[PDB]
Design a protein around this ligand. Structure first.
Ligand SMILES: [Mg+2]
Lengths: 275, 51, 140, 100, 107, 97
């Protein structure tokens, strides 16, 4: 028994750490930990993004309808979220279609609808609102905040910024948080399609150009388990696109996708977004 | 050479002498530093507390 | 024992957090883990020199390969780009070789054009007009 | 009994009144307190009145009446640091607590 | 060493410079002993520098807890939910100021 | 693993004990009690080191000549051998001479 206290204290806390790694507790929400002042942190959320809100309106932007119902379930022993989220998602849909119709004038509106339904999807918006401290300020029933609820609160925050400071500042907000989520993503990672060849055929009918001949430009290792093909797509013996693949069908479909990126201006070499 | 050896003689004796008088002067000006009351009393602040 | 050492689990564990990924008993037995951990740190600092060296030879391999695609050799490309006052370096030329092969093709065209003006200039000797790409920009 | 001191606005006339009541000429601010009874009466009246006493660490420092005058018009303000920080007009993102 | 440690690629949090710049530091949590020799430089930091600091960036909410600690800490929390706990044990005010500005400037 | 698993019982120390509150009193009995006692007449301990400090060979010599006559037999014997050893060490071994 070695006399002293400091090594027993250090060892006591290392045992505490191995207890936390072996059996970690279920994650508690942030408002149920020390160092929380809700009002101060809503104000901080305002100043963080570099705009002003009417603070009561932003406060109602974080108050869900599930929270009021389970809260009144807890009373027996507040304005909801839905109006602001309605306004915010209506506005963000029409402004995203404004930006994406302005900077991509050749896109089909099916494509603009799938882009906008990507930039306002649950995956994108929930990825954005967990890094703007929206989730920490959401008054929700259950933790972690389920993704439909958090989508609703994010567009509620957009609605509150709209009523706060008009359509131009929210346009810059949506530009700076939702549009930057399509950086480094290809078009058909966002607008998924089946049968790009038929789509390319129909688009070439709309420009009054003939149907393209798929036409094998380069190949290698044709009789092996690792071939490479470049199928080209010619229109009146001038190619519009050419793409590679492991088989011929794969390369032909992919050349169809290259042609569709080229018709719509959504190439890898397009002029970047001007911020 | 730009000069003969007769021409160069003592053409830099002053600057050499002043340089060595500087070396000599930094050598003979070596002494313990000043000790201050403020440093010794400033050790009392290790038990400065709040009220 | 007046004062014997209490805090010795932590000295051992300062060494052994660096050895947890070795093999054999080097990962657990301090006496073995110390020799291997020291020896790992010495390699870790002498490897900074070799990181720089091996990147540079990697770039010379990639510039060599990409310039052999256009018929040039590596000394011809680097020499006759210096002589055009294009002071791009090996990292950038290797990255242009992979990612921007038209810029790399035009750099190989600029270097072979300069190389031929070097030939024609150093063949017809005497007072003559200099080459067009052979001219230098004087800085004062 | 609280160490807070706020100097009065009629302190010149009060202090002068005490100097006359312990005595009296013009240029009364340059009266030496070399007499020990005179100093005890003067500072004892002021301590009795103002509730603020010249400490032992400073008691030899006043050799003129002017020095007592210059002593009794520094505001000695006494409160806890929790009451100094929270009254120093905090921005809305500082929060200070005192687990004491 | 690099083979012992994990590695990652250079990134931002939500494309942090594209649209606008967002301060990635949400909360600081100072905990400072009232009577205690290790939190002296923390005390002089709360008295002198923390109000100026709290005004120079309002997106950061700062909690000074002031309990009887034996080692004072600062706990930086970030927008992406990272937590950096650093000690300000026996540091001068200037060293604490450079540490807190270091935590502010990073992600 | 020679480290203890539970932290030990706390060390309750009374700083305002009788001994601690009155430590150091009558250290100045000389200089402000008219020099009738020295402070070294305040210290209690072995009779051969009241107001005397020496290294170990000197402590052993002094102990032998001051109290060695009534020392026990094998203590006296151990002490004679310690003086004999410490003699042969201080006088014939070391670095500096
Ligand atoms: Mg080298």
């Amino acid at each position: 028994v070695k006399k002293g206290f400091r090594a027993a204290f250090r060892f006591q806390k290392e045992l505490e750490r191995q207890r936390l790694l072996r059996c970690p507790p279920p994650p508690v929400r942030r408002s149920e930990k020390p160092n929380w002042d809700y009002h101060a942190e809503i104000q901080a959320f305002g100043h963080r993004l570099q705009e002003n809100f009417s603070l009561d309106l932003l406060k109602t932007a974080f108050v869900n309808s599930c929270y009021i119902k389970s809260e009144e379930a807890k009373r027996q022993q507040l304005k909801s979220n839905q109006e602001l989220s309605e306004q915010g998602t209506s506005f963000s849909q029409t402004c995203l279609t404004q930006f994406l119709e302005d900077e991509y004038p050749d896109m089909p509106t099916e494509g603009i609808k799938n882009l906008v339904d990507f930039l306002t999807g649950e995956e994108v918006v929930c990825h954005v609102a967990r890094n703007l401290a929206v989730e920490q300020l959401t008054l929700s029933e259950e933790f972690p905040v389920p993704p439909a609820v958090l989508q609703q609160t994010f567009f509620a925050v957009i609605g509150a910024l709209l009523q706060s400071s008009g359509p131009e500042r929210t346009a810059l907000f949506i530009r700076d948080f939702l549009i930057t989520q399509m950086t480094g993503k290809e078009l058909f990672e966002m607008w998924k399609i089946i049968n790009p060849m038929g789509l390319l055929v129909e688009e070439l009918k709309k420009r009054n150009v003939s149907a393209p001949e798929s036409r094998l430009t380069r190949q290698s290792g044709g009789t092996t388990a690792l071939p490479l093909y470049f199928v080209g797509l010619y229109c009146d013996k001038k190619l519009i696109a050419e793409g590679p693949g492991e088989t011929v069908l794969v390369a032909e479909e992919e050349a169809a996708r290259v042609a569709l990126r080229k018709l719509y201006g959504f190439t890898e070499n397009r002029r970047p977004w001007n911020y | 050479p730009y000069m003969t050896r007769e021409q160069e003689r003592g053409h830099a004796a002053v600057r050499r002498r002043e340089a060595f008088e500087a070396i000599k002067a930094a050598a003979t000006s070596k002494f313990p530093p000043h000790r201050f009351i403020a440093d010794q009393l400033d050790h009392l602040n290790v038990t400065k507390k709040w009220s | 024992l007046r004062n014997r050492v209490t805090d010795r689990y932590f000295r051992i564990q300062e060494v052994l957090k660096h050895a947890r990924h070795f093999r054999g008993r080097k990962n657990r037995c301090y006496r073995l883990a110390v020799r291997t951990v020291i020896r790992a740190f010495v390699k870790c600092t002498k490897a900074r020199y070799l990181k720089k060296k091996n990147m540079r030879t990697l770039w010379i391999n990639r510039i060599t390969a990409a310039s052999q695609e256009h018929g040039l050799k590596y000394p011809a490309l680097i020499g006759n780009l210096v002589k055009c006052q294009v002071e791009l370096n090996r990292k950038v030329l290797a990255d242009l070789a992979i990612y921007e092969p038209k810029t790399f093709k035009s750099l190989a065209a600029l270097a072979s054009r300069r190389r031929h003006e070097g030939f024609a200039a150093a063949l017809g000797d005497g007072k003559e007009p200099e080459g067009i790409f052979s001219r230098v920009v004087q800085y004062h | 009994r609280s160490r807070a001191y706020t100097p009065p606005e009629d302190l010149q006339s009060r202090l002068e009144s005490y100097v006359k009541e312990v005595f009296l000429p013009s240029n009364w601010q340059d009266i030496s307190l070399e007499d020990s009874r005179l100093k005890f009466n003067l500072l004892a009246h002021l301590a009795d009145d103002l509730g603020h006493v010249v400490p032992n660490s400073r008691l030899h420092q006043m050799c003129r009446v002017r020095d007592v005058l210059d002593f009794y018009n520094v505001p000695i303000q006494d409160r806890s640091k929790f009451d100094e920080l929270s009254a120093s007009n905090l921005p809305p993102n500082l929060k200070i607590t005192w687990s004491y | 060493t690099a083979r012992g440690t994990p590695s990652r690629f250079l990134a931002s949090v939500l494309h942090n410079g594209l649209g606008r710049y967002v301060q990635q530091l949400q909360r600081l949590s100072f905990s400072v002993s009232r009577d205690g020799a290790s939190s002296r430089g923390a005390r002089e930091f709360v008295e002198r520098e923390v109000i100026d600091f709290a005004r120079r960036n309002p997106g950061v909410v700062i909690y000074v807890n002031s309990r009887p600690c034996c080692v004072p800490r600062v706990v930086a929390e970030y927008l992406n939910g990272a937590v950096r706990e650093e000690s300000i044990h026996c540091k001068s005010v200037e060293e604490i100021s450079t540490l807190v500005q270091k935590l502010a400037d990073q992600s | 693993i020679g480290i203890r698993l539970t932290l030990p019982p706390p060390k309750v120390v009374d700083r305002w004990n009788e001994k601690r509150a009155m430590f150091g009193v009558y250290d100045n009995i000389g200089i402000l009690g008219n020099f009738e006692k020295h402070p070294k007449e305040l210290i209690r301990g072995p009779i051969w080191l009241r107001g005397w400090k020496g290294n170990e060979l000197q402590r052993c010599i002094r102990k032998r000549k001051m109290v060695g006559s009534r020392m026990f037999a094998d203590d006296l014997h151990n002490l004679n051998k310690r003086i004999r050893y410490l003699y042969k060490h201080f006088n014939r071994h070391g670095k500096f001479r």
